[PDB]
Amino acid sequence: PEPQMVLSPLTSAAIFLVVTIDSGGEDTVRDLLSDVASLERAVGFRAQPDGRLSCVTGIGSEAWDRLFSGARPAGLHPFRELDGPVHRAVATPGDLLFHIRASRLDLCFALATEIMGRLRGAVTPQDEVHGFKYFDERDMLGFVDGTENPTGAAARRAVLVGAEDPAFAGGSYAVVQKYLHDIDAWEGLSVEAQERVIGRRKMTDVELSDDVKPADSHVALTSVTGPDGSDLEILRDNMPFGSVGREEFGTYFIGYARTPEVTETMLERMFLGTASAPHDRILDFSTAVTGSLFFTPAADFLEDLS
Amino acid sequence: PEPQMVLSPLTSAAIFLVVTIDSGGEDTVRDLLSDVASLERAVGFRAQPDGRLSCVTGIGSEAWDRLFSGARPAGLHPFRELDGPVHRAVATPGDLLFHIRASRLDLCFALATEIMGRLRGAVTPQDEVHGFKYFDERDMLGFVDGTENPTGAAARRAVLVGAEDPAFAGGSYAVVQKYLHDIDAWEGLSVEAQERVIGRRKMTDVELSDDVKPADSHVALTSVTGPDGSDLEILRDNMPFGSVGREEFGTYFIGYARTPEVTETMLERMFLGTASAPHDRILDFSTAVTGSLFFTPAADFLE
Amino acid sequence: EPEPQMVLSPLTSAAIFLVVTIDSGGEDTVRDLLSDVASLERAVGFRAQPDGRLSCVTGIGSEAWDRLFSGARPAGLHPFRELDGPVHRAVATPGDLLFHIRASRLDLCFALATEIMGRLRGAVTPQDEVHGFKYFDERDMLGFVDGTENPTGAAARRAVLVGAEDPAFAGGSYAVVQKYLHDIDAWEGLSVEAQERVIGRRKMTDVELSDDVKPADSHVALTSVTGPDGSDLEILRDNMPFGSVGREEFGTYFIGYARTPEVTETMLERMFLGTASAPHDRILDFSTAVTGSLFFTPAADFLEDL
Amino acid sequence: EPEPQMVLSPLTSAAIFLVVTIDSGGEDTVRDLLSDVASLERAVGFRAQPDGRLSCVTGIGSEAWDRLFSGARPAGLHPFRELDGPVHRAVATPGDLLFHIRASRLDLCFALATEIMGRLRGAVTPQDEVHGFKYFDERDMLGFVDGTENPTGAAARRAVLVGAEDPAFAGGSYAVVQKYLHDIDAWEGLSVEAQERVIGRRKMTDVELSDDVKPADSHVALTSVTGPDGSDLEILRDNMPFGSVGREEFGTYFIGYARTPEVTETMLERMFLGTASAPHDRILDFSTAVTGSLFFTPAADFLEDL
Amino acid sequence: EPEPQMVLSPLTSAAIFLVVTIDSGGEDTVRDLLSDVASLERAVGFRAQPDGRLSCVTGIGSEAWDRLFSGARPAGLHPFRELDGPVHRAVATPGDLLFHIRASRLDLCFALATEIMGRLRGAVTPQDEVHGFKYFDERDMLGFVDGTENPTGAAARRAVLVGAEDPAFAGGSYAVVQKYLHDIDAWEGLSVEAQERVIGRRKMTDVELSDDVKPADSHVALTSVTGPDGSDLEILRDNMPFGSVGREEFGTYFIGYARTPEVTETMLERMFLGTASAPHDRILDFSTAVTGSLFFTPAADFLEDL
Amino acid sequence: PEPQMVLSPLTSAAIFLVVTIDSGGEDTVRDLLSDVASLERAVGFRAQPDGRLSCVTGIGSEAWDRLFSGARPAGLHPFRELDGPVHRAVATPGDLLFHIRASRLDLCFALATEIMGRLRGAVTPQDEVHGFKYFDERDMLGFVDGTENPTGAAARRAVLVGAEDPAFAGGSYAVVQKYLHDIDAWEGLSVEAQERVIGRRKMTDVELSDDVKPADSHVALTSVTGPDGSDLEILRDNMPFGSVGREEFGTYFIGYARTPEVTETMLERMFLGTASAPHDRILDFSTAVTGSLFFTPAADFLEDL
Ligand code: HEM
Ligand code: HEM
Ligand code: HEM
Ligand code: HEM
Ligand code: HEM
Ligand SMILES: [Mg+2]
């Protein structure tokens, strides 16, 4: 089947649009979903090959029930709120995700405008974030972000639904969380203390050894193995965002996975901890203010809608 | 003397930072002004020649008197609110302008972060806009934006203070207005109707001929001839901005001129109207929610 | 398995369309050149890779085929079918060999055209030569974005590549060329809104007109074909602007590839002869076809094995 | 104070050379186009800045000057001087206006040429139109690097722009154009070493032959000129490859700018009429001039102030 | 399933070739780095993407294989076979580990080389370190385009990657390295025509000499090899210029990847021992091999899983 | 006058060639000097505009006397060896400098090859360094290198000989030193400790406050004010180089100045120290193994021989 552009080339700009569908908004939404590929072509084609404009469209659990009368993707459910001893992963409203990426913010904005034009009156905006690449693929904590993402066949194997849910093959599960950083608290750490928090060297992005990597580092808690001892993997495209005047320095977290169980296991280790880690130290400097789970179906699922 | 980067090469990204100096914030502000060129080099240098990072720093009339003793720039005064028959050009608070431009937002955001971090607790944010290049130098109305800006020597005679105010030579006057657009109304016009509002053909960016250019087109009202019959010019770097969710479709207007009078003449013709023109038809689709005037000194002045 | 020619090229800014006839006795020279044309393409192109994007798709006409080769022929290979509509005519013009040369740069196309024609000197007569150039944001001389609804990836291969329906010629394709000249003065007399009604898409934003407003005689309405099984019948186009300002020649070089000529020829019949609902494609009221040729572009190994 | 036209252009990979004659009574229309030509350059080009690099250098012939303007003539303006050499002829061909249009892309050149001709259609007759393209690593149709010894910076400004010697026309220049067609068959018949003896430079490495080896009838030998003070007399060239493979047209469009036409004309006399040591420039044994025209390209403000 | 190393790399302008031997007791340190080398590639390369194009292909010699790994050996892995020809010798020199590091920039190559050699310090003895740079037009130190006839796509995969014939090692390849020093004074004494007869291609145009013209002792004649089924036997090369102007060192670092070492060895036999028609490859009259090593470059996941 | 490309656009790649002129090599060198700009165009023009190929040609004090009749440049003299309490700036032989830069090492190598092709048997190689910039203009110590270089008119003012020595106007003075780093010792410091050595922040390249910048930091000691109480500036294009096998991790230092006195004062502060600093902390991790001074004349001086 034909996947949406979950595996995107390198992109320097992104818009995350999360909306809820208003009472009676379903027909307008279905019409828009049947045209969303066509609208990405209308905005993007003229700018190819360099524009690299794509939209990954996601649908929430409750939205799915409202929109489609047939089978549901096997792993689709509302985002699971996590109430950890110190940190909380909040569950916030979100029926439709538009994960818009390009080499330029103008292409993202132009597509977001077309999509919201078609949806005006049928949806209510919940979140809008304009993400930007920050230096050499760094995030707002100044660490390279995306290093250990799977690539090529491993990325497709990690992200794209297959024979386990054949009606939904080539779909994926997207988890979003908007994080705001305490940059005063962070900049109070030495680089070495920051490296102990993340689990990688700051300037050179080399993973700390097994012997020095803390158990409560971000890398330690988000490194997960299945029972066969193979790494369980997700595909992240985290995007810096913010407003200097309001002291908002953010990471917009997005992780794609073939099943949400992997992303949810990483989140549990982060927020609830383990026997050797109280919680992910990154959360002592990062507050999640959104949390939503969406299924991003195969492109042909959206194209074939009435 | 050496100007700030008022005459910047074209940039695809910008941050417009307007702040008020809090009571007691003067010394922190003067120390930052000392270092703003150094912070620009610190953030920008390593981004090669492609980064094109610059910050143009401007000081408002009220701020000037709080910050500096002695002579004031000849043309420095607060933004003049225009109460037109239909359209208003509001005057809004602004002591400091940071006009940050680069080929990338990150360079703009990183330099904005350095500047605001130094001023934290000395200033109150008034406005912050993250501008992006829109297609082939187009604006939110879908028209090419910058076409008739002066270049080279003509740009320097238009924007840079010279012998007429010797102690402020190499400075400029910046006027900013944040505009929000009625895109629903605008998209209601035929392309031909839109071309009559702007005064240029939409796709080809060809100026309408004298015989068909409406007197209340944007181009007609912002074309000003001086005492000698030559064009009085300004240098604009207008930037699209917005939020699709809140239906904010924005033009951040910034015009630089040797003297505020040229920019002020254009605003009066636009908002107050003329014998031949009720007002600039662009204002039937564009609302000004800020208006501020700044003097952007010579680089040497800031130290 | 059979290696296709580069029918599916990444986007290219420059093209040379070279159409020649094979002179009496020229067949042996042509066969030698056909066995070397892939080798010449590597000679010119390799040093400019990866950005050069140089390729040549070689096509052979119906009459030329029978002059060059013995035994089985491509199932759909026939001379271009002249269409005499009530208003507009699609002429058939001579053409035995097509070289469809594309690159990121005209020089690579020019150099390869020179190598090919140097090998065919004394064996072929020039019929048509057009040097195409990208025109702003993938626009044509009518000022509309051209290529937006092309199929991509697997859908593109399915549309253009001969397969099991003609297995001896699997990996080949059918190219239809028509050199069009536009009446720009006539076109510029129409409002943008009237032009959008002719094409069926919005001019600046390239958004397809809604089903309620798209005219039945619009280009997009008449070149949108659904098969009896309900699926879209697709072709892959690489239309190239060309012209001469002094001669007031403003053209579209139309090239369309399809796994059978039937799809392309259906679109042509609808355009030139119209339907129940449309006298003819309104684009032809501003566009004159001055050439018409059909070629079979065989699998690369067919040409190499000669 | 005088603003030159873009005589000294950055390197541009595309050009259009448009030479036209002014019809009887076409003067008023041409004067209006000259007063608008910079505004049309901005209309087409500004949207593509900074990478587009679109410029038009507008040139006026000797006869055309007298039809269009009263007051002073530029000091060096006269019709191109036909050279009738013992073997080779530099023909004088009609041309009243030159538009030398350059950009990083042909589309911009073509769009600007289209706007200019749209204004002049009823007032002028096209005489020559050439679409030039960069060929490999700044090479010409003879396979040699072309432009190497051009002056740059201050030296170029001093060699090209009218100053104190003609104060009313300061910031102008003199353009000599010649369209050359090459006998590529004959050229490729030479060894690389024989080609190097014709040009005066090493072919692949572009290293100038030493004084002891450089033939006196080499191109470099005859187009190397010294003034009375003994310093080099220089022109600024922007020669552009062009051609048509089917018509076997392999062209160099020669254009040379000089502060006075006398430097360019001495080079032409040495090439075509030869010296004590050289019958003629050996490049002419492989190159035939089919046009020859001389233009004054005035300061931009001279054209604006019409 | 199996993940090949970046044997099939995008064209790269920079390379570092590192050959080391494993000291007494160096096995554990080496295995640890082998398990980390992909991780270190990402640490250095990710933050430089997508322009960086950093990769490292890691090879293991025959002797080193038995020191490091339990279980099966690759079926074709053996020490480099010295060829003592009538005139020229293919020397064998020591090498346990190969790091074939490539990127768009030498500084990225050097950063990865640093990390690898930092981990190996005290466990290995450096044998050879070459910093390769390609010329503008994929041209080598002899001034010929180098890579033209490399296979691409499926044919490259077919030629290079171990498949069903040795299934435990599928996705691996065999690397042969030879560092060549050129006699540039002797080479530059030849005419271009004479140099073309040595290589078997035209120097400027990179057009292959016809079978009737290509000398039997030409580099292209002797390295063109057919199977027992008449099909081409191919290898994938990425030869890099290197050297030192002070020391008058002008080199080609040869690296050839093949599914079996037998194809590369057949080519080396033809070059150094000649045929019935050729004493030896004329390229060796200007090129001396000073190193020779054979390595197995396993599937990436073989090294990852140590 | 036409300066050489001393004020170059940023370049990723460099070759530094230092040679001595053999006995009887003067005429061959003179011929090469008269052609070196011609050769730079030969290799560089067809690579434009992205190639950014230039060569700056420098002549040492002793060689000037062997090569030229006429006036000597005012400031030209042998590099002065500095014997500090801890660190030494060695003086090493050098008659000709070829400072070759481009976006690509192949362009540098092609030009170095044509230059050394012409000088074969007239000169002896002393140093050859192939330099590579890290991305973001970072050096072998991981720091952005070039940040406070003067630009535009300020750079012209700091670098080019003017009316002070009008027969050599458009010239400049190049000091070279090849530094080998102790990378193991360097990578032992915290980022914070390295920032105290350099005097700038590592990731953000923001200069340390006056209140925290150590007096023995590299920025503090290479920051010079003249009598006027205004900045004495040089123009640097330092290039990482090395060899992983030999554990050679280097910075090739090159500084251009209108007069050598400015560069030499910086070297005196670095190596001999001040009232408030024993020596430049950068020298605790950097050993100079070469040191030479050249005059890089106006291009037209070399052309007109
Ligand atoms: C404040 C929010 C976050 C920030 C700033 C952040 C930043 C980073 C950084 C700097 C790395 C190391 C480089 C890399 O491999 O990408 C990393 C790795 C990773 N992060 Fe995050 N991250 C955040 C949230 C999350 C969340 C919520 C999850 C999962 C639900 C997650 C999953 C991962 C994974 C799986 C890795 C790779 C670990 C490995 O296999 O080495 N991250 N992140
Ligand atoms: C909603 C706000 C604005 C928008 C969208 C806008 C857009 C444009 C456009 C599309 C053009 C034509 C192309 C060009 O030459 O740049 C233009 C021209 C111009 N605008 Fe604006 N503009 C705005 C506000 C202003 C304001 C407030 C001023 C002056 C105070 C101004 C002064 C000019 C001038 C001087 C020109 C050049 C006219 C000429 O000489 O042809 N604009 N503007
Ligand atoms: C005569 C000059 C022609 C011009 C200027 C032209 C131009 C265009 C334009 C502007 C579009 C809409 C954008 C797109 O999807 O590409 C389009 C679409 C199309 N054209 Fe053409 N066209 C021409 C001739 C033809 C011919 C002769 C055919 C078929 C034989 C054809 C087949 C198509 C198809 C299939 C589409 C896509 C329609 C859809 O599925 O939405 N065109 N063309
Ligand atoms: C007919 C086709 C022409 C071709 C193919 C051609 C080609 C070349 C080439 C390959 C060079 C050497 C590299 C360089 O640009 O410096 C050159 C140099 C030159 N050409 Fe031409 N040229 C032609 C006609 C002309 C004409 C008609 C003139 C003068 C009226 C001219 C004047 C020059 C000059 C002045 C030089 C520089 C010589 C020097 O100082 O080294 N060329 N040309
Ligand atoms: C001095 C060392 C070498 C140099 C400078 C060199 C250079 C070249 C050049 C210029 C080509 C022509 C363009 C191309 O197809 O890549 C070529 C082709 C080739 N070289 Fe080499 N080569 C060298 C050593 C070797 C060695 C040692 C082998 C094999 C063990 C080899 C195998 C080949 C092969 C197979 C081809 C392609 C021939 C074909 O099928 O057309 N080369 N080489
Ligand atoms: Mg017409």
Residue numbers in the entry:
A (entry chain F): 8 to 313
B (entry chain D): 8 to 310
C (entry chain A), D (entry chain C), E (entry chain E): 7 to 312
F (entry chain B): 8 to 312
The authors write:
Dye‐decolorising peroxidases (DyPs) are the most recent member of the peroxidase family to be discovered. Three DyPs have been identified in S. lividans; two A‐types (DtpA and DtpAa) and one B‐type (DtpB). Using serial femtosecond X‐ray crystallography (SFX), we have determined the pristine structures of the FeIII and FeIV=O redox states of a B‐type DyP. These structures reveal a water‐free distal heme site that, together with the presence of an asparagine, imply the use of the distal arginine as a catalytic base.
A composite compound I X‐ray structure at 100 K was determined in order to assess temperature effects on structure and further confirmed the presence of a short Fe−O bond of 1.65±0.17 Å in monomer A, with the mean distance in all six monomers being 1.76 Å. Fe−O bond lengths for compound I and II from several structures of nonmammalian peroxidases determined at 100 K are reported in Table 1, with the short Fe−O bond in DtpB most consistent with a compound I FeIV=O species. The heme redox state in the crystals was corroborated through analysis of larger DtpB crystals suitable to obtain electronic absorbance spectra at 100 K. Identical electronic absorbance bands to those for FeIII‐DtpB and compound I in solution were observed in the crystals. No further change in the electronic absorbance spectrum following addition of H2O2 to DtpB is observed for >1 h at room temperature (RT), indicating DtpB forms a highly stable compound I species.
